């Protein structure tokens with residue numbers, strides 16, 4: 001074991017190892033609440049997330065297991081890394097809390113854009129890094145599904161990492177058209193839509209699609225990408241869905257070069273390949289990496305795929321104690337980086 005020390009912040013108690021000092025709150029709410037601290041073993045600043053009631057319910061227990069397993073598997077430069085996981089419990093029986101530690105970052109992608117107008121070369125490097133981490137993650141059948149500026153961290157020198165549940169020191173704005181209108185049977189390209197949305201907002205200083213709800217959001221999207229064609233229509237399972245879309249005033253796809261004028265024509269071409277209604281036609285992360293747009297950063301030799309990731313557990317229905325024990329084993333088996 002190591003040595004812990006109690007203390008309360010905001011209204012939540014923090015039982016952490018002595019190696020972490022200067023716990024300053026960052027943000028709470030969700031299933032987490034996180035603090036910024038100093039890692040004495042490394043001399044570096046870290047982010048420590050104390051999960052809220054980790055094993056209170058079955059959804060909590062399994063979502064706690066899911067995240068731990070995920071973070072444990074992720075070994076890539078553009079994906080948030082797990083520096084350490086700990087608990088102030090000495091046995092499984094007393095196991096009630098879970099703290100996860102990562103590198104502290106410079107800022108949310110939301111701050112960067114919200115501040116000034118980045119250069120084109122900045123857009124290329126940032127979007128290139130997202131896609132690099134995306135290829136890694138997708139190569140393991142992992143779908144982020146919640147890509148947005150706040151889930152994107154960049155340090156002082158514009159180096160980027162993908163995280164999740166980013167707590168700022170509408171997710172529907174970056175939501176693919178399909179995963180809203182339901183349709184179900186969503187896939188990884190759902191992430192490429194988000195990237196296309198993030199990129200557009202980096203080139204222009206505003207939200208591509210600021211929809212107020214699922215209805216507005218879809219309206220904003222279609223004005224751009226148009227209304228579903230006969231080919232897309234043929235692939236829509238839901239009777240209510242195609243009844244819905246087919247009932248709208250039909251819209252044409254817009255000329256992106258007209259929509260994103262002044263933008264690098266190579267960026268527009270990438271935008272065009274990402275912002276496709278039909279998920280089957282969107283470009284993939286890997287194929288996007290070879291796009292002329294990233295000629296300056298692209299290296300097919302430094303664009304790794306992930307070791308295979310087994311998410312069989314996702315299908316399991318277990319008890320809070322079974323998920324908690326599974327999670328305890330994962331904590332115990334943790335080997336630092």
Ligand SMILES: C=C(NC(=O)c1cn2ncnc(Nc3cc(NC(=O)c4ccnc(N5CCOCC5)c4)ccc3C)c2c1C)c1ccccc1
Nearest residue numbers: 047048049080100102104105106107108163164166167169
């Ligand atoms: C710019 C400021 N902000 C940060 O530096 C900063 C802010 N937050 N807020 C939320 N969580 C953070 N980090 C984190 C995140 C996970 N979990 C994940 O990111 C996960 C959980 C589940 N799935 C995924 N992935 C990510 C990769 O793609 C697939 C899904 C990924 C666990 C533990 C931790 C400490 C975090 C950091 C590092 C900041 C800097 C200085 C002072 C104040 C703010």
